Design a protein around this ligand. Structure first.
Ligand SMILES: Nc1ncnc2c1ncn2[C@@H]1O[C@H](COP(=O)(O)OP(=O)(O)OP(=O)(O)O)[C@@H](O)[C@H]1O
Ligand SMILES: Nc1ncnc2c1ncn2[C@@H]1O[C@H](COP(=O)(O)OP(=O)(O)O)[C@@H](O)[C@H]1O
Ligand SMILES: Nc1ncnc2c1ncn2[C@@H]1O[C@H](COP(=O)(O)OP(=O)(O)O)[C@@H](O)[C@H]1O
Ligand SMILES: [Mg+2]
Ligand SMILES: [Mg+2]
Ligand SMILES: [Mg+2]
Lengths: 470, 35, 15, 487, 39, 187, 466
């Protein structure tokens, strides 16, 4: 293998000069003579027998002339069933303090996306248990989902609820990739999965692998940890034909770390400061996250929306890479409704009367229509007043507020915030309850009876309790 | 762009919220009586 | 040690 | 003195001379020296200039080294000799710093002699991983009613204080620092919180006033004040938060609990932007460097709550961010909002409406929430939060006005948790919907005086149990009804 | 007292140094011998 | 093929061309004759006629190219020197000729074990103690290295000795000693 | 040491020293000029070349001209002889009264006072202006800033402060004109001559003037603030006096720094400003401070570009002041002068423990009622005045009366408004605003509180209009 020498160190970008045997792009290089392991990923060939690499760890204590050794292949992580229950970092090292991950096969994190002939068109609705995502923007078994939202709207709480429900009702080796999020949340997730039997530290029967690169890692690690998790999921999908789950949180940090190294990589900025290679890098990543004919990868991705923009280049670019987007609004969470899903901005590709039937589709479209007319009537309520509106308009606004409340739901992972019991509602109960609220079958009940309940039965029970107590 | 008076959040949005929810609180405490 | 003695002399001289 | 200036201030001075590896200043301007040589100098290593100055070797280019200067570059000339130190930037850490005012490198600027520090600690260390941490459970008591009730803060949390200029952020931090006095001189050892205040880019007389406020309340015996004021070089204002964070990580790694306030991080971001623009690094949005999010995240990730196999230590961070014209959607504010575990939004509109502290309870968030509260405060604060919400959507309505006037608090008056819960009890249980709001604060002043003068046993039981038991609830009902009769 | 003790002492520390510069080729010989001890 | 790295690395276009010629001559065992030839062409190109001709920016390129080729085939140079002058003339780097020769000269210098050593004193010192200084500083070198001394005098150090050998550097001046003891006496 | 100019681009001149490279901040003298052209070293570039900044015009500088290093930074004459005189950036008399015969000279580049020299006393300074004394009171020895856009009243307010505080003062005063109209400097000189403050016949002068105006190259406008700083610093340290330092305009310092930074080869920061904006502003502002060796009551006018208070220069200068008096154009359009924004001016001595519970309560009540009126402004503007409750109508009436009462005629405005200048003591301000808040004047019209002194004059005007 080749042997190089560091010739420049500027932040997280390291230039290495190879007198012989220039390493191909995307190879991993091991800096020699360090306490821990520092891996450099080749990014550019600068000519003059010099490459420009990105560091996967900190670059403190690096010397010009320090010897670098070419590994001969991209960052190869250990993949297999032995990574189940374990935690690993970007370069595939155990960070749970449980010894080494002893697999028999190693897979590079840089591979090609599946071709066009390896695609699959089958769409089966994935029942979630949450009323709004099941009614308006239903998920597909094998499709990329995506959860948009600003800071403090409930992306992590919603992804924990989804992990709970699906990954426990599942039998297919889920995989969680923590990309540039808080380490406190990583510890909380680890211990919550340990207590609920999903991670079994004894006599391993665990069904979730963990991959964690958090906010304290340099941009290289935060930009390649998503690909490491993706590689673990790709192995579980290909060499076992299993149905795999891939939870990524947060996926915006991948593009953000790319943007953070772009400037030093020697590239003119694009719009909003992003790298000129935002869309094609995001596409190279996201086209491997897909259901092929060999297996399936149901991918739930939390996507940070900077300052509730939703037109920022990173969210606007990731919209096209999804099937059932679930946008979380802040104005809805400030109404006390949770989850904060925006009904007039969430979208699914299986919301088709030939996929979810005519009843589900009609109920969803009626909910969205009445909420839009509610939005339109709010202006008249603003300037005229609620008194002069017709009884037609008053009744439609009442139905709209009641549907708003009924879209909320208590989560089993949000007891600490609300103290209420976690409710999981089947699909038919949701369809029937919204159909009955649309029909007017409960126009005699207070709107506060539908707030934070399960099906409509609990709504009328809460109505009865509020009627007796008041 | 309907509902913009409520999306802005100025004076005419806060009073919209106040008007609407006081009306509906009155109607709610009245409907809890008829039950 | 012109500076060993000076720092102890000049201060003793400051006495 | 008369002999004690030579006896060991000279005879013991380590006057040895050794063969040291050096470099030579090619150019020097705007605090960025380009040194030729230093072939073996490490990245982010502290170097030393021939004129007593110090600098950090940031850029390692093939033909020179970009050394940022910790001081004034007026004393540096071309052809000067830059000598290595062999060590990455490190600060003195210990318990001796408690009660001192230091600069970004750990040197005493209060004129009380050297710090008797035995150990040193890097500033760019790595935050603890996933295993050494545990859930944030212990409450960090601020003494402010709105914070301690509606936006509670745990030990190991990162709560952002964000607002415009002159809205009350530094006052929130100072109240939080002063309040820990009751716990620090008490008996229970694992309730002691050693505060740390980092002043970044502030005027020097402001830090003098702040040290005077903290010593008037006798709150300096447990506080470290790191100050990189406006006249200090940009590298010093960029290094101050990491120095303070290492001083707090000392406590966090040794079974103790610390608290660190970065006041503020906007000025650290500005100093880093200058320091990196002068190194010819390409600018990003608003000319900030590309990795300013990393700059703040690798700092706010070190505020952790360790488990018991690591000592059970803690480090609570309270970063401060100034926004321009209430624009919370800016670059650095959104970065730090994405990093932290919640916010405390201050507004000037609420500030001028008599609501002081102007904590917007609608926007203020605490991602840990109830897990960081005592049981009694939780019992009362749940209903208080819900009632305040209900009032905020219809702005009952008189109860909500009573509650908001209850939340108002003076400056440098941090209450105890027992008194806080008694006040919010007397507010939510209904005994105040009879008074007019213009006498609410009068009632609370007189009521607190009466309770602390006469009913120390009830408050002692509150402080001991943590729950407002039915016995305590009944006795407190008695006290509040009798005083309301008296009023 | 502490005010007088401070300024008088810093004036003292200034006296000695501008006095020693006022106040010898054995150093050049001492520097040659001390240089050989580096090895 | 792949280049050979000179013992020192010079940067810029001057350094690029000097490293190029070092790798060129080292591959053919001709470093010394091309050193002589390049110093010669430095003398030639600091000629008023030739300098005012080729450093003139509004003289056409091929004209000074053929003039350089003429003087280069007249001077009976190695094919490496001819190729270097022609390559400098094509790329338009005639202003960088003496920079390139200086970089190549310092490459050959550091190739001959010549380490730059500098001693400083308040006033000029004895030459016998200068020979003692040379012999003693020789001990800081490996065998195969050469002493190239430059004794400058600086009366601001109040006496002592400031020795810098290569990049290693000892400060025995009494000025830095009084500074150190004073900062120790203050703190 | 003698160098030779090797580059001239505007105000930035490169010099190449064959021996003895001068340190940074040194002052170099160009040889062969009709007057004195001083170059201030700013950077070292290598190759024995420095990059200076010229204090005067650079026309006629040839590549190769001789430049001698003086050996020290720009040194100005300081002392009690600079009182009643005018000096430029480099300390030369520009009043045609001969040289300035001082005994000591102080470099304009000194280190800021350390942390242990700061004093913490915050006694109030009464100005005689209603809104200032009420809502954002000044402090003796604190740093004051008068923000404001173009043509809102920064200069009128600073001349009013000079009229009220400077001549009624005991110590000394320093006025540093930094990039403003030269005719305003002439007006100030002649006004101080007629007022006996500046005496051309004896040594009883009480003001030292330092003037580098908007007709000066950017180097002079960047260093004349430092010249004024140095004069005031001498009067504080070496005299122990209580000094008044007036700076107008302090924004031109940053603006000239930007103009020269363009050419100094630096990557620009936001709005095209120098990357070293906050650091230069800090190294300048940390010298303008009260220590335990003397006090400096600093009043600085701060221009606001394009009326944007979030511009990097004002947004950076906010954090250096003890009391900010933010002027507004929206208020100035209503004829309310001074145009002080009541809901944007602050002060660190607006503290009940300092000013008194009465004063604090009056100020906070005025601010609360003005904020209520501001919140109502939208509905008032769209749905008319009728749709307000009568409580809101009373709040609006009282708030408009308070707005009119905050206005005041200035003694310096006796030439372009005609009304006599009113100087309102603090007690009259507190009493009048407390009465207006209590409702004691809900029968007088709002135009009766406009441009009056104490509240009795408002009552008299209300009676006169009826
Ligand atoms: N809880 C409070 N009650 C009453 N007054 C307060 C309170 N908090 C702050 N103030 C006052 O409001 C002003 C704000 O001062 P403070 O330093 O706390 O805000 P800030 O966020 O640090 O603004 P800046 O740093 O730009 O000066 C101060 O004059 C202070 O006296
Ligand atoms: N289903 C919910 N019920 C109650 N509160 C919730 C719910 N979801 C989110 N929240 C609240 O909103 C906050 C946002 O937490 P988080 O999931 O980390 O959002 P994000 O990661 O997008 O910033 C939570 O701390 C929680 O208090
Ligand atoms: N206090 C005032 N009273 C009356 N008129 C004023 C007052 N302040 C400003 N003006 C008017 O507004 C104009 C602006 O004056 P000036 O102080 O020079 O503004 P600036 O210095 O900010 O450009 C003045 O010509 C004056 O007519
Ligand atoms: Mg999240
Ligand atoms: Mg502050
Ligand atoms: Mg003006």
């Amino acid at each position: 293998a080749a042997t190089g020498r560091i010739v420049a160190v500027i932040g997280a970008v390291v230039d290495v000069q190879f007198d012989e045997g220039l390493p191909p792009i995307l190879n991993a290089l091991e800096v020699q003579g360090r306490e821990t392991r520092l891996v450099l990923e080749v990014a550019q060939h600068l000519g003059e027998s010099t490459v420009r690499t990105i560091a996967m760890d900190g670059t403190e204590g690096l010397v010009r002339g320090q010897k670098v050794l070419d590994s001969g292949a991209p960052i190869k992580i250990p993949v297999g069933p032995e990574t189940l229950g374990r935690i690993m970092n970007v370069i595939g090292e155990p960070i749970d303090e449980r010894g080494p991950i002893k697999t028999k096969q190693f897979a590079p994190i840089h591979a090609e996306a599946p071709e066009f002939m390896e695609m699959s068109v089958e769409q089966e609705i994935l029942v979630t248990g949450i009323k709004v995502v099941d009614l308006l923007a239903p998920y597909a078994k094998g499709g990329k989902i995506g959860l948009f939202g600003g800071a403090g709207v409930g992306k992590t709480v919603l992804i924990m609820e989804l992990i709970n429900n699906v990954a426990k009702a599942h039998g297919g080796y889920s995989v969680f990739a923590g990309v540039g999020e808080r380490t406190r949340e990583g510890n909380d997730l680890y211990h919550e999965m340990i207590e609920s039997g999903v991670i079994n530290l004894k006599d391993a029967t665990s069904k979730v692998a963990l991959v964690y690169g958090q906010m304290n890692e340099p941009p290289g690690a935060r930009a390649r940890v998503a690909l490491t998790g993706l590689t673990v999921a790709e192995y579980f999908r290909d060499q076992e034909g299993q149905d795999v789950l891939l939870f990524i949180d947060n996926i915006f940090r991948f593009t953000q770390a790319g943007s953070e190294v772009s400037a030093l990589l020697g590239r003119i900025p694009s719009a909003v400061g992003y790298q000129p290679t935002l869309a094609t890098d995001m596409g190279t990543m996201q086209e491997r996250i897909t259901t092929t004919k060999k297996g399936s990868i149901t991918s739930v991705q939390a996507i940070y929306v900077p300052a509730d923009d939703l037109t920022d280049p990173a969210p606007a670019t990731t919209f096209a890479h999804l099937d059932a987007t679930t946008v979380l609004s802040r104005a809805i969470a400030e109404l006390g409704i949770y989850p904060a899903v925006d009904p007039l901005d969430s979208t699914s590709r299986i919301m088709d009367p030939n996929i979810v039937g005519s009843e589900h589709y009609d109920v969803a479209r009626g909910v969205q229509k009445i909420l839009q007319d509610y939005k339109s009537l709010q202006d008249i309520i603003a300037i005229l007043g609620m008194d002069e509106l017709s009884e037609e308009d008053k009744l439609t606004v009442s139905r709209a507020r009641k549907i708003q409340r009924f879209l909320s739901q208590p989560f089993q992972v949000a007891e600490v915030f609300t103290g209420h019991m976690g409710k999981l509602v089947p699909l038919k109960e949701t369809i029937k309850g919204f159909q009955q609220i649309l029909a007017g079958e409960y126009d005699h009940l207070p709107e506060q009876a539908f707030y934070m309940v399960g099906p409509i039965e609990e709504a009328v029970a809460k109505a009865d309790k509020l009627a007796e107590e008041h | 762009g309907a509902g913009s008076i409520r999306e802005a959040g100025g004076a005419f949005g806060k009073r919209e919220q106040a008007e609407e929810e006081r009306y509906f609180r009155a109607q709610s405490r009245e409907q809890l009586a008829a039950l | 040690q012109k500076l060993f003695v000076d720092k102890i002399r000049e201060y003793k001289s400051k006495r | 003195e008369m002999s004690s200036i030579l006896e060991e201030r000279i005879l013991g001075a380590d006057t040895s001379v050794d063969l040291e590896e050096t470099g030579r200043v090619l150019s020097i301007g705007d605090g960025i020296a380009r040194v030729h040589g230093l072939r073996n100098v490490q990245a982010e290593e502290m170097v030393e200039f021939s004129s007593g100055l110090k600098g950090m070797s940031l850029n390692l280019e093939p033909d020179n080294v970009g050394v940022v200067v910790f001081g004034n570059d007026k004393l540096i000339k071309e052809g000067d000799i830059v000598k290595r130190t062999g060590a990455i930037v490190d600060v003195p850490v210990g318990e001796e710093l408690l009660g001192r005012v230091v600069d970004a490198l750990g040197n005493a600027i209060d004129g009380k002699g050297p710090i008797g520090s035995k150990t040193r600690r890097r500033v760019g260390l790595k935050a603890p991983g996933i295993i050494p941490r545990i859930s944030v459970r212990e409450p960090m008591q601020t003494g402010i009613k709105a914070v301690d009730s509606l936006v509670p803060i745990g030990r190991g949390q990162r709560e952002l204080i964000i607002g415009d200029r002159q809205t009350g952020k530094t006052s929130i931090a100072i109240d939080t620092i002063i309040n820990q006095k009751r716990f620090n001189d008490g008996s229970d050892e694992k309730k002691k919180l050693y505060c740390i205040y980092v002043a970044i880019g502030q005027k020097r007389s402001t830090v003098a006033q702040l040290v005077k406020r903290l010593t008037d309340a006798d709150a300096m015996k447990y506080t470290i004040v790191v100050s990189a004021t406006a006249s200090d070089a940009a590298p010093l204002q960029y290094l101050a938060p990491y120095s303070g964070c290492s001083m707090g990580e000392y406590f966090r790694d040794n079974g103790k609990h610390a608290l660190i306030i970065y006041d503020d991080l906007s000025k650290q971001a500005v100093a880093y932007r200058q320091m990196s623009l002068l190194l010819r690094r390409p600018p990003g949005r608003e000319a900030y460097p590309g990795d300013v999010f990393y700059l703040h995240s690798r700092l706010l990730e070190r505020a952790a709550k360790m488990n018991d196999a690591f000592g059970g230590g803690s480090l609570t961070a309270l970063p401060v961010i100034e926004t321009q014209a209430g624009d919370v959607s800016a670059y650095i504010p959104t970065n730090v909002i994405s990093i932290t575990d919640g916010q405390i939004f201050l507004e000037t509109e609420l500030f001028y409406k008599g609501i002081r502290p102007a904590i917007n309870v609608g926007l203020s968030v605490s991602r840990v929430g109830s897990a960081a509260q005592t049981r009694a405060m939780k019992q009362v604060a749940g209903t208080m939060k819900l009632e305040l919400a209900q009032y905020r959507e219809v702005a009952l309505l008189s109860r909500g006005v009573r509650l908001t006037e209850l939340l108002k608090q003076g400056q440098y008056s941090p209450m105890a948790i027992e008194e806080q819960v008694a006040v919010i009890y007397a507010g939510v249980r209904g005994y105040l919907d009879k008074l007019e709001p213009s006498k609410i604060t009068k009632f609370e002043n007189a009521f607190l005086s009466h309770v602390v003068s006469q009913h120390q046993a009830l408050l002692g039981t509150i402080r001991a149990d943590g729950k407002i038991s039915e016995q305590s609830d009944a006795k407190l009902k008695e006290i509040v009804t009798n005083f309301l009769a008296g009023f | 007292q502490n005010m007088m003790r401070r300024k008088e002492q810093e004036h003292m520390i200034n006296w000695v140094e501008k006095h020693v510069v006022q106040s010898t080729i054995a150093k050049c010989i001492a520097d040659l011998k001390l240089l050989a001890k580096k090895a | 093929a792949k280049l050979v790295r000179p013992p020192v690395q010079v940067y810029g276009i001057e350094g690029r061309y000097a490293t190029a010629l070092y790798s060129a001559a080292s591959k053919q065992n001709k470093l010394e004759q091309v050193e002589k030839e390049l110093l010669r062409v430095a003398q030639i190109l600091k000629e008023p006629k030739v300098a005012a001709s080729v450093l003139n920016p509004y003289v056409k390129r091929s004209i000074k190219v053929k003039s350089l080729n003429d003087i280069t085939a007249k001077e009976r140079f190695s094919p490496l020197t001819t190729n270097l002058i022609n390559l400098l003339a094509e790329n338009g780097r005639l202003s960088n000729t003496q920079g390139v020769v200086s970089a190549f000269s310092t490459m050959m210098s550091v190739h001959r074990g010549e380490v730059p050593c500098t001693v400083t004193s308040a006033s000029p010192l004895e030459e016998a103690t200068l020979s003692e200084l040379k012999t003693v500083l020789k001990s800081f070198l490996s065998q195969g290295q050469v002493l190239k001394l430059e004794a400058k005098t600086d009366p601001s150090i109040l006496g002592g000795m400031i020795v810098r050998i290569g990049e290693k550097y000892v400060d025995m001046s009494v000025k830095t000693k009084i500074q150190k003891l004073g900062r120790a006496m203050r703190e």
